[PDB]
Amino acid sequence: VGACVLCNSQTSLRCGACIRRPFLCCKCCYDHVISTSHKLVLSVNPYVCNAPGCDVTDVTQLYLGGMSYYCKSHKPPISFPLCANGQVFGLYKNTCVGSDNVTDFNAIATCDWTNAGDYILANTCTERLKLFAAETLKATEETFKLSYGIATVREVLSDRELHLSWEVGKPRPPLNRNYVFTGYRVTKNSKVQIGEYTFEKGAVVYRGTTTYKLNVGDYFVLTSHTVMPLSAPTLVPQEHYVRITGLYPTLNISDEFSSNVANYQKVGMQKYSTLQGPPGTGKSHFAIGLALYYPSARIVYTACSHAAVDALCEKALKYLPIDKCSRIIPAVECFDKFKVNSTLEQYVFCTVNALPETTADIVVFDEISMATNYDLSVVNARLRAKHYVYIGDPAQLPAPRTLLTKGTLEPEYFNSVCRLMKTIGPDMFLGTCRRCPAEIVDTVSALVYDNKLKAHKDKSAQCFKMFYKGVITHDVSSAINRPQIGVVREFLTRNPAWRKAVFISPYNSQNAVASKILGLPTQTVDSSQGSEYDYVIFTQTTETAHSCNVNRFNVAITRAKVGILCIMSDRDLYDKLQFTSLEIP
Ligand SMILES: [Zn+2]
Ligand SMILES: [Zn+2]
Ligand SMILES: [Zn+2]
What DSSP letter does each residue of 185-214 carry, written as one string? EE-SSSEEEEEEE-EEE--EEE--SS----
CA angle 215, 220, 222 (to 5 degrees): 160
Pairing of strands 339-340, 219-221: unpaired
- How far does residue 45's CA lie from ligand 2's centre (Å)? 16
- For residue 400, say whether it is annotated as part of any ligand binding site: no
- For residue 436, say whether it is annotated as part of any ligand binding site: no
Q: Which technique was used to obtain these atomic coordinates?
A: X-ray
The burial class, CB within 10 Å (0-12 / 13-18 / 19+), for 538 is: buried
Other Cβ atoms closer than 10 A to 123: 22
What does the alpha-carbon distance between residue 557 and residue 296 come to, in Å, rounded to a whole number? 39
What does the alpha-carbon distance between residue 59 and residue 64 come to, in Å, rounded to a whole number? 10
- How far does residue 7's CA lie from ligand 1's centre (Å)? 4
Strands, E assignment, 210-336: 219-221, 272-276, 299-303, 325-327
Residues less than 5 Å from ion ligand 1, measured at CB:
4, 6-7, 25, 28
- For residue 15, say whether it is annotated as part of any ligand binding site: yes
- How far does residue 221's CA lie from ligand 2's centre (Å)? 29
Q: Which ligand is nearest to the CA of 33?
A: 2
Phi/psi for 81 (5° steps) reads -70, 140
Cβ-contact 4, 11 below 8 angstroms: yes
Which of 226, 232, 160, 235 has the alpha carbon at shortest distance from 198? 160
Q: Which residues of 17-48 are buried (b: 16+ CB within 10 A; e: fewer)?
A: bbebebbbbbbbbbbbbeebebbbbbbeeebb
Under 8 Å CB-to-CB from 546, ≥6 apart: which residues?
506, 552
- For residue 7, say whether it is annotated as part of any ligand binding site: yes
Other Cβ atoms closer than 10 A to 406: 9
Sign of CA dihedral 150, 155, 156, 161: negative
CA angle 417, 420, 423 (to 5 degrees): 150
- How far does residue 68's CA lie from ligand 1's centre (Å)? 25
Under 8 Å CB-to-CB from 296, ≥6 apart: which residues?
248, 361
Pairing of strands 62-65, 68-71: antiparallel
- For residue 279, say whether it is annotated as part of any ligand binding site: yes
- For residue 325, say whether it is annotated as part of any ligand binding site: no
Under 8 Å CB-to-CB from 171, ≥6 apart: which residues?
147, 148, 149
- How far does residue 231's CA lie from ligand 1's centre (Å)? 17
- How far does residue 98's CA lie from ligand 1's centre (Å)? 4
What does the alpha-carbon distance between residue 163 and residue 219 come to, in Å, rounded to a whole number? 11
- For residue 306, say whether it is annotated as part of any ligand binding site: no
Which of 310, 316, 349 has the alpha carbon at shortest distance from 333? 310
Q: Which ligand is nearest to the CA of 30?
A: 1
Rg from Cα positions in the chain: 27
Cβ-contact 434, 457 below 8 angstroms: yes
What does the alpha-carbon distance between residue 416 and residue 429 come to, in Å, rounded to a whole number? 18
Other Cβ atoms closer than 10 A to 272: 21
Cβ-contact 22, 14 below 8 angstroms: yes
What does the alpha-carbon distance between residue 307 and residue 335 come to, in Å, rounded to a whole number? 9
Other Cβ atoms closer than 10 A to 70: 22
SS3 432: strand
- For residue 173, say whether it is annotated as part of any ligand binding site: no
Pairing of strands 533-539, 502-505: parallel
Architecture, CATH, for domain 433-581: 3-Layer(aba) Sandwich (3.40)
What does the alpha-carbon distance between residue 1 and residue 91 come to, in Å, rounded to a whole number? 8
Cβ-contact 308, 530 below 8 angstroms: yes
- How far does residue 373's CA lie from ligand 2's centre (Å)? 21
- How far does residue 33's CA lie from ligand 2's centre (Å)? 7
The burial class, CB within 10 Å (0-12 / 13-18 / 19+), for 535 is: buried
CA angle 160, 161, 166 (to 5 degrees): 125
Q: Which ligand is nearest to the CA of 57?
A: 3
Whole-angstrom CA distances from 220 to 303, 379, 512, 558 are: 27, 31, 22, 35
Under 8 Å CB-to-CB from 568, ≥6 apart: which residues?
465, 466, 467, 468, 540, 574, 577
The burial class, CB within 10 Å (0-12 / 13-18 / 19+), for 577 is: buried
Cβ-contact 348, 300 below 8 angstroms: yes
- How far does residue 73's CA lie from ligand 3's centre (Å)? 6
- For residue 350, say whether it is annotated as part of any ligand binding site: no
Which of 578, 553, 556, 583 has the alpha carbon at shortest distance from 466? 583
- For residue 25, say whether it is annotated as part of any ligand binding site: yes
Pairing of strands 325-327, 204-206: unpaired
What does the alpha-carbon distance between residue 556 and residue 530 come to, in Å, rounded to a whole number? 10
- How far does residue 78's CA lie from ligand 3's centre (Å)? 15
What does the alpha-carbon distance between residue 124 and residue 5 come to, in Å, rounded to a whole number? 15
What does the alpha-carbon distance between residue 117 and residue 333 come to, in Å, rounded to a whole number? 38
SS3 154: strand
The burial class, CB within 10 Å (0-12 / 13-18 / 19+), for 112 is: exposed
